[PDB]
C-alpha cells in the first residue's frame, strides 16, 4: 503494498498506523541503506521510508498544542526517493507534498 496516496491515507484514518511496508530512516540505515547510491531496495525488498517525525519547523503545517507530524514517502518503488510525501498528524489530519516539502494540501 500500500504505497499510493488514499490507500496510506485510508490506511492511517483507520488502524492509525502505517502499513508494513514502511521503515524509518535510522531501520533502513542499519540493513545498509545509503541515500548517495540510491540502494534502498537492493538492502530492503518491497520496503519505502516512512514514519519519521517531520519538525514543521517553517510552520507550513496546522500547528496545535499536542499535535506532532509525522512524512511517509508515496509512489516509492527502487531508486533515489522521489519528492511524494504524505504528512499525518497524531489528530488523523493528512497533507499531501509533491514537491519537496515546499506546498501542502489537504487530501484527509
Same mark, same amino acid.
Given at each position: 503494498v500500500i504505497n499510493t496516496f488514499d490507500g496510506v491515507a485510508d490506511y492511517l484514518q483507520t488502524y492509525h498506523k502505517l502499513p508494513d511496508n514502511y521503515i524509518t530512516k535510522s531501520e533502513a540505515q542499519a540493513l545498509g541503506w545509503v541515500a548517495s547510491k540510491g540502494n534502498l531496495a537492493d538492502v530492503?525488498?518491497?520496503?519505502? /521510508? *516512512? *514514519?519519521? /517525525?517531520?519538525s514543521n519547523r517553517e510552520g507550513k503545517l496546522p500547528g496545535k498544542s499536542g499535535r506532532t507530524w509525522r512524512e511517509a514517502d508515496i509512489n516509492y518503488t527502487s531508486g533515489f526517493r522521489n519528492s511524494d510525501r504524505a504528512l499525518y498528524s497524531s489528530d488523523w489530519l493528512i497533507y499531501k507534498t509533491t514537491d519537496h516539502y515546499q506546498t501542502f494540501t489537504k487530501i484527509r
Open positions: 530492503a525488498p518491497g520496503k519505502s /521510508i *516512512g *514514519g519519521d /517525525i517531520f
